[PDB]
Design a protein around this ligand. Sequence first.
Ligand SMILES: [K+]
Ligand SMILES: [K+]
Ligand SMILES: [K+]
Ligand SMILES: [K+]
Lengths: 456, 456, 456, 456
Amino acid sequence: MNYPAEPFRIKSVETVSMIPRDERLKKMQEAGYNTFLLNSKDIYIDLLTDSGTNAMSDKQWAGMMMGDEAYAGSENFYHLERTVQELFGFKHIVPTHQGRGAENLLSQLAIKPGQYVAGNMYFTTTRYHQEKNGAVFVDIVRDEAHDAGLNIAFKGDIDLKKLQKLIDEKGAENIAYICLAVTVNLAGGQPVSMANMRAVRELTEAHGIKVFYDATRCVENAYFIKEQEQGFENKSIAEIVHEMFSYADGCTMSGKKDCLVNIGGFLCMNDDEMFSSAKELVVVYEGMPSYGGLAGRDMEAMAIGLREAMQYEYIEHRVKQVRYLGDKLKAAGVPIVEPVGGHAVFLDARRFCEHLTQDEFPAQSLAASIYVETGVRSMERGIISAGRNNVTGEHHRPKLETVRLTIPRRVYTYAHMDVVADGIIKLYQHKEDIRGLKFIYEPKQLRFFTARFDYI
Amino acid sequence: MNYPAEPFRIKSVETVSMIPRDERLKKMQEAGYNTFLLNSKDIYIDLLTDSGTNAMSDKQWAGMMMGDEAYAGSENFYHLERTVQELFGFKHIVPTHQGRGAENLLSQLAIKPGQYVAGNMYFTTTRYHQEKNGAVFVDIVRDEAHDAGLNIAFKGDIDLKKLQKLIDEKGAENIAYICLAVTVNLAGGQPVSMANMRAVRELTEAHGIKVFYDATRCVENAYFIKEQEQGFENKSIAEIVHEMFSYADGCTMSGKKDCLVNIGGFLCMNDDEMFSSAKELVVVYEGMPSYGGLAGRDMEAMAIGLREAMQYEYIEHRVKQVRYLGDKLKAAGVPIVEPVGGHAVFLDARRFCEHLTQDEFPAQSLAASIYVETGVRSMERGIISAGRNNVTGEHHRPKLETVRLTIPRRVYTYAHMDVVADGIIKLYQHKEDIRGLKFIYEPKQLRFFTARFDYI
Amino acid sequence: MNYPAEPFRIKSVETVSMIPRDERLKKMQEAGYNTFLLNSKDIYIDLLTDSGTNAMSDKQWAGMMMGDEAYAGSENFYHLERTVQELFGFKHIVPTHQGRGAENLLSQLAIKPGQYVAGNMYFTTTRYHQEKNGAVFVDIVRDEAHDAGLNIAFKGDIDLKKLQKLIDEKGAENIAYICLAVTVNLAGGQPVSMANMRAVRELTEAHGIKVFYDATRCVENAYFIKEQEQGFENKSIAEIVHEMFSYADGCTMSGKKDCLVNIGGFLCMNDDEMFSSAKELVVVYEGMPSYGGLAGRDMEAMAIGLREAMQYEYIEHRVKQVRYLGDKLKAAGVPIVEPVGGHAVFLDARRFCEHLTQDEFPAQSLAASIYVETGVRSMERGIISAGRNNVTGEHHRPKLETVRLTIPRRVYTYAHMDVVADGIIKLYQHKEDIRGLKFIYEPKQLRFFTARFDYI
Amino acid sequence: MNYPAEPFRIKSVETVSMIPRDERLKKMQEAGYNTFLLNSKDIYIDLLTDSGTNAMSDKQWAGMMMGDEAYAGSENFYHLERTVQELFGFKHIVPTHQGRGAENLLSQLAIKPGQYVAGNMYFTTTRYHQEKNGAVFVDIVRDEAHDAGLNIAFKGDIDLKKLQKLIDEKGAENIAYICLAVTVNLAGGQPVSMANMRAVRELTEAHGIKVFYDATRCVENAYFIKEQEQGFENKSIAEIVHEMFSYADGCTMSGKKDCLVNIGGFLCMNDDEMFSSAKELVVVYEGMPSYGGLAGRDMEAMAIGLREAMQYEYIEHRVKQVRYLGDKLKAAGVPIVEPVGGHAVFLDARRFCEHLTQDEFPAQSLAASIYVETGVRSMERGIISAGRNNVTGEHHRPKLETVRLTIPRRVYTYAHMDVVADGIIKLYQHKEDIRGLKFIYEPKQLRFFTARFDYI
Ligand SMILES: [K+]
Ligand SMILES: [K+]
Ligand SMILES: [K+]
Ligand SMILES: [K+]
């Protein structure tokens, strides 16, 4: 089916409501025209993020009642540990409270000041932890990944020429590691092919260069491989995930995305010495290696959720629900990033707001406007998120200036997607009413989370 | 709007197996083609009943953690008591484990042997308790109610002329009470008008006759009054509910329907002497006047659920979701009972399977086909459920030969309704192919529950 | 150990508090000097009953999240069914919402008007359902069971001479069945020996007479066998329970006691025809045979709880905790029923209130006084509970006029038992201050639940 | 009262296996005689830590079902915020996943390289974050605090003369802040007086120096002030807490201790500029200012828990339960650190095992013996945890050679405390029999966590 029904039933519900346009306009101004600054009670359908907003299952909630809260030797840690060993195939696991805790560890463990880390397009917290540990980020994604309207498969793929070039020009000894994200978030949740993961492993291994995956949406990625990469049509999601990680030296994961939980993450690796060092560090920032700043019940929920994520019908429906929203928007002529990604539809703010320059912060502005007009919260994914260049002080200027309608897993229905698609279409009808924004408060890093603006 | 989006979001899901057609055919065969014999774990969408199958909210689940399990004097009882007093406007309430417990008490309290109870059609358990206690049942519903093809509003209304006639012929002192069900189950879930409730109150009061409501689906009823009865457009669901019960001396309620719970019910009355007698009887069958065969946590969940049921958008969506399924089937020419009721759609299997005689069990066979083709369980409400006359050996032969698609509250989406409808519509397109069934195992009693069949 | 520590940890807690003596005195009068009529919020340590007041485990609560709420074919029903078949060894099970639902079924199924039912001392709801179905109750417990101060083991044992006499005098065809309760509640929670269950089975079987157990505290009973009956010291609690039921034709159970749950019960039998008839009847009163007026989650909790009850250390501690309270009271000279039973300490009201006649309702009075002085709720187990004789109209006059400090399972600690033992001792210090009571309101049956009194 | 009964009852239990001594010896052996390597499932009473091991209430569990999981603007954040503002009287709050997350932020915000931080002794993570950020730590605790045998009140007090000296010698501008821990962990859980907190506030304020509290066990601290400091007898715990923090510029809190939760913490401050800087940093390590690496449900549980912790009877019992264990051990002559603190009893293993040298690891071996004899897990806080100097290869040799019996809140009873005490007392009676240990596996770092031993 193009649009399969939900492969589950509703066990329990939460109420939703809208507040009038008048009240919302007030709300937008008080939050400094930053969607991140509005309040949950004041949002009707909350598409700010798929991070930590997922609906758990009855089985996960049963697990939540069996939290073994012991400081060491918790049954829940053992369960998480064996589940991740089985499904991802890495030797060692260190839990963290969420993904950026695992990134903090990896960046501290694996980077010497002055080294390069190369990856398939930047990410916000990722680039910050790289640069903060003294690395220079090098983007080795294909150029097309940066082309919002260009409909090509596996846009997350690393350009092997660009990786080769980097090795020739910098020397392998000066490359800390390759960071391969699956899927790639800021390109629109775009997948990476198995062929590419293999080619990357083969080339890096020849030069002694390590490869670490950002596993945050690895199940979404595995769906796209099953659906689109020749030869995978009859492999299970689980077989695909396990092969994917077989091409990496470890990974970082925000369990708050594809593990179907509201909190949780981990770091995995194969190297014994790196494991020892990681355990020394986790103690500083997260907790003991035996819980990593998580309750036992959350290690349990994450163990159960990661295994539920492997069910074909679940991930099929997850991705196709997002695709439905994208398809409706596209059929009506609304400009979006193509092809639609695994976790969100990204309105292309540049086409949505032609009359604005990117220095007017179109994406940031549009997010505000969608809120005012519809009560739907969405996230800036453009020049604000891109941050400032640490060499020059200027904004980084990403070609992708996008606005994210991000779908939490197992929370909404197609009828909710229809409510969203209608609101957006209507706002499009007068997109020339969307006004320029400028900063009134800029944080020194990760500025998008809490920055505030005023209309120009 | 014809079909509103869900006025809630999903908090947690209930996992399902998603077994394919070929495995569903084997399950159906192991169940002897009787959907009552299917395992819950093998069913995608379970439309067997809207009784006790509802999804609770996060607020209810919070209440579930706050059970005061005291044998007497529980805080949860006091919460339930004050909620029902507020919402229904009865003086006194006695909790019961579900509806038939309340019906048991009412019939023992209110009936002298040889007296008549008259009502708007009947229900099996309700009428059972009436007759076991010495009453003669008299149907006083409008003749129109019995025409399953007649599309008319407020089809559950009592014919005042039949009630007058009853009083004139039998005498007021020989009428135990009038039993008014809101909505009326056996007509397909048909509402009763406020005008009718007042007319019945006025007539009965003039002769000193009591009126007790079967309040099981009273909120669905209130929604039909708000939608369709002139003058109720500025009235809340809560205002409509409170006015309805103001025309009664008390009620029985299966909370498992419109109170949005999985278990629970109660008996209400205004008469102090009846209340006293009820509390003397509740202890024989159910429990204390302050728990009545319910855990404290369930009194809490029912108190919270009944108040949630008052939200306009909730009950609008509830009824319009069922209407969606009915509308879709009718548009494709599928024969159904009309008009569609608040909680279920009934397929007319007599017309669906015109090539089959009632002796070949078309409703039973059609419910089998539906499961095999879609993973949807439905209930036979036809010749099999009618049972066999054990004196003569002849089938009881009901005019209604139906398959009931009963919709639990807040469990399913419109996409699930599409799975149901598309599958039935596809079956209808080659209806002549549906095979008759014959008994291979038949119990002497309760045959619908455990009978097994094979194809002719 | 005499007093083992709790063989579990506290997973979660509930607050407790006391209200001043002044407030309580007011409270006692408003509740008509009937403890059953006070409110949970107004009680500090609630020893009214061990029925439905037990603390569940983490595992049971995990089960509570996996309620399969289907009308038929619930995984929870299957689990309960197989657990009871395995542990009790009966062929068939019909769930009920609690014990008196199962008694209603058994009494209707197994009694012809005018027949006798003989048992080991009466019980309140049991005797009512017998008499209400037309049976005459005959007490065949040993005389010593009625002697409160007499410390003998296995006081619940049936007097085989008395059973033989009954058969000689009435004829076996006129005995509906023998009702054997394990333990026996009103004798002080007194156990029955395996030897006695065997002797009873052998004698009844020879005459074709059926035996049905009241299984409500069967695990407590099995503990006493393990502890005290020669030859059982090395059998497991589970092996003992399974042998016990091997001597019966079925049973009734209030799961609210030894199954460690807050609601739930069942009826078991071996007879296929009785099973069919039971399923016909359960539909009238409780629900479908597939849930019997219980949520799926409660069938699940009861299945899990019955198996947890089999853990030796759990039941050892359960019984010895009660014994601790009894021992402290006895060491101080407070008069109690001896030996202490499995679930409560029964203050002997006759010795506690020598200056009152039993027509002054000493037990009922004392319960009120303990409340006023201590904030501890306890239950009347004497002449009020005994009810009226249905032949003569006079009070039944039990030799045992007792007041029950009933201990919910897994709820309190020894420190709580110490608080209780101190309060009681102090009140003893002036027991001549306890005043006569008389009726001001008497219900027509089971009068103790809601009767009200005034001081004479 | 010396030892109050539990001011709560048990809502639910956590199941335990109850394995006998012989099976415990095998588990201990499989764990290489290191209690840190024991499986939680094999432990009866787990006194490894009071961090994150507490039992929640029914009210907290209700809050757990009400998680608003929004990425920003969660209702649970607003609830936590207003509770902490009300109870602690700080202007601003930033949630963190636990204490060390808050400490990370504070030290980065408040320390310039080369500056001193002075405090009442130190804690490992706290001091780590101080030093990693460029600070020199100076101990300003009273000399008395370091005498582990000295039984004196308010042993956690800062010596004002040491603080004066520090200011005089180094200059106010070179002091980053004073870090005052309430209670003081390393002295055995020793309280700080309100007099001392005011004196420290007055001195620091006069030189413009900031004061930040480690609020981790501030409620235990407040209880000692109420019990022992003149003039605080008419003051509630809440009033004492609010006054304490009125003498600070902010605090860090591991909610996992006195907030009665399994995960959670926060950073508080009064300074608007610091608040702004903190929110810029929280996003790098933890999450949004409105979740800080916590699920919505955990912010809710912590908000509810902190308010429960204010109940006098709760914290009285908490501290007196630990005191009970200490009192019982001392009465039998068992050597312990004095006076007993709010959350743990420390056994002096140097004196307990006088026949052993520190090189034979008496604390480690004693913790092993305790587990084998009782099923109680305790923590080695001695030479093993001190680690090895990797430069010289020599053990770090601490003056304190202790076994920590750390008491989780609301988990255990006095009977459990008796299991602990009776077992230790029995071991003490034949203390000469306790065998020394030697390394068979030693990691280079974090040795206490995974080292394995065998008997000498
Ligand atoms: K149910
Ligand atoms: K209960
Ligand atoms: K924990
Ligand atoms: K969350």
